[PDB]
Amino acid sequence: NFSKAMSVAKQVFNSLTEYIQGPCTGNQQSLAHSRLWDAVVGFLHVFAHMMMKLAQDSSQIELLKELLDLQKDMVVMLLSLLEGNVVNGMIARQMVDMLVESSSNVEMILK
């Protein structure tokens, strides 16, 4: 159910990555000013609560295994966006703003 819809988002992140997987500054610049930052902020909040709910559940493993793969494919796009960057870069500072908003969400993720 929710896993099937989530598996679709995995393909989108890989497709998004493949466009910028090489140092394509033209596609990187377009994604910087798009609504990509807003999408990840919502996704990060969902993943933080999804981990905790399945953590308490003993038999909720099949969704968790599918869940863990999604953010791993997400950060590759985040790394791809930072690929070829410069210090004080415009794209780099965009993540700084987005990390402030989702700073609470990234908490408890490491645990």
Place of tokens 């988002």: 9
Distances in Å between the Cα of 12 and the Cα atoms of 2, 9, 19, 70 are 16, 5, 11, 10
Residue 63 to residue 68: CA distance in whole angstroms: 9
Residue with tokens 């099937």: 4
Which candidate, 102, 82, 74, places its Cα nearest to that of 9?
74
66 marked among binding-site residues: no
- How far apart CA 51 and CA 106 sit, in angstroms, is 12
Nominal resolution in Å?
2.9
∠ CA(102), CA(107), CA(111), 5° rounding?
A: 145
The amino acid that residue 65 corresponds to is K
Q: What is the DSSP string of 10-55?
A: HHHHHHHHHHHSS--HHHHHHHHHSTHHHHHHHHHHHHHHHHHHHH
The experimental technique used to determine this model is: cryo-EM
